[PDB]
Design a protein around this ligand. Sequence first.
Ligand SMILES: O=c1c(O)c(-c2ccc(O)c(O)c2)oc2cc(O)ccc12
Lengths: 243, 289
Amino acid sequence: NRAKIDSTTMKDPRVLNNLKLRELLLPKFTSLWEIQTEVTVDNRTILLTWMHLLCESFELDKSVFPLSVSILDRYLCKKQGTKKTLQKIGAACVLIGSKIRTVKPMTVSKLTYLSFTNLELINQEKDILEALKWDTEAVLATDFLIPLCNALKIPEDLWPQLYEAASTTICKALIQPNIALLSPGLICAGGLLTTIETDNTNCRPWTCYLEDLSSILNFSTNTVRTVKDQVSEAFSLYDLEIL
Amino acid sequence: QQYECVAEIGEGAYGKVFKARDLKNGGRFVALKRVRVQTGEEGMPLSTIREVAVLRHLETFEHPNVVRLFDVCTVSRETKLTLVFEHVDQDLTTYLDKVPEPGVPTETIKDMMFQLLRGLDFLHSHRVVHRDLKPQNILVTSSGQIKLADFGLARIYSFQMALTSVVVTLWYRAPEVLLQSSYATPVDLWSVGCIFAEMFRRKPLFRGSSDVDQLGKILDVIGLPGEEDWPRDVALPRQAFHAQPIEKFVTDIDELGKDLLLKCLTFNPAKRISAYSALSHPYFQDLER
Ligand SMILES: O=c1c(O)c(-c2ccc(O)c(O)c2)oc2cc(O)ccc12
């Protein structure tokens, strides 16, 4: 498989302005899984640990898991889910998410053998799509990594390694419910800072882009730091013993 | 259920594309792209999903140069997935024929090439790559407006993302693609160039039979690159092959335009002009714009 390299027109202009823009197009207005009356947040944290495990194990593109979570939350704003139904609902979000953001899709057999019939998953993928009016795609926390590095003037020869870790921790951080509040733009920043920190990549003290990030994302500096602390938290709270 | 199929207007690969009427508006014509979702076991076809996803994700922007997606019909009865788009009077290949001699007027070919670059600038500015540009995928309205269509292969392009070994008919595939290397937004610039060079002379600029013949036809024009513009990544050497004036192929092209057609048909992708800068290029200095 041929992985993609830098494209100066895709990640060097004012793609950032547009990412910030497209971000503010999924207004929040409602709480996390607010409507659900039978599944809780702790159920989400669990479900998400299994989805994260699925995407990591199968080496799917870093963008799959955070698109899967997006679908899942959105869908659970319009339809009800039951305790014995989440696993399948989530399976289906990974199916959809992977079909889009990665070259070799996660098949139905791969998700069934892991739990429904290979026709129960299918009617689930369907019920999710109609629910979202097929409006599947979205702005992912993971989308900001490069744009921010560039805007932050971080040197390109670092990008690959910097990107590699940043993505990983951000994915683990998204498992935590406290992060679903934050916007993908901030969630990313915090993730970059966190990665920059616990691994000096010849990057001036992580506490340098602290401003640029603020001037860039338009929030203050207390905001960016707070987020850096949160993502680092969500990251450490990641624990397989919940499965 | 309420769409009376009038006639096929070309068929894709996983489903034909019929033009139909509907009881929604008098006799309104909406483009119908119905995909055969055979009950294999994979669920909804990936293509159908990416496409609708992308289109549906930017719609709010109501960009002029992007085709509009009306609806998605699905009968659970295999299952039949019918995607309903807007209907334009004809695609570009159809226009590039029914045009009186001697072809399209040098100014009309400039106004579409602009509109065509306006869709890509938009697309790319949102990290999207329409990996399948070709005359058949461009909708030309009677009014003269240009619409990009068939986002079947379109996808949100992110760093270190893995890539499939194939896309773009052939006569529009970019060298890097024909070589089995990485790729990105530049692929569409190569196509736009091919489509640009194709608007003057009403016929494909690089019609080839295979990967070697196509790669050779392409080079047979731009000329063998330099040991610095060939992938160090993989495949056939640059020796694998052994610089004719671009006009010799494009029946009379303006010195500034002929300069643009080459900026798009640049072998090394990183040196290939971007749709952004392309809308700034001198070849557009004076259009009704
Ligand atoms: O009016 C047309 C149209 O809307 C589409 C179209 C729209 C969305 C797609 O995804 C697609 O593959 C084709 O094609 C065409 C092809 C022709 O020869 C002529 C007219 C149209």
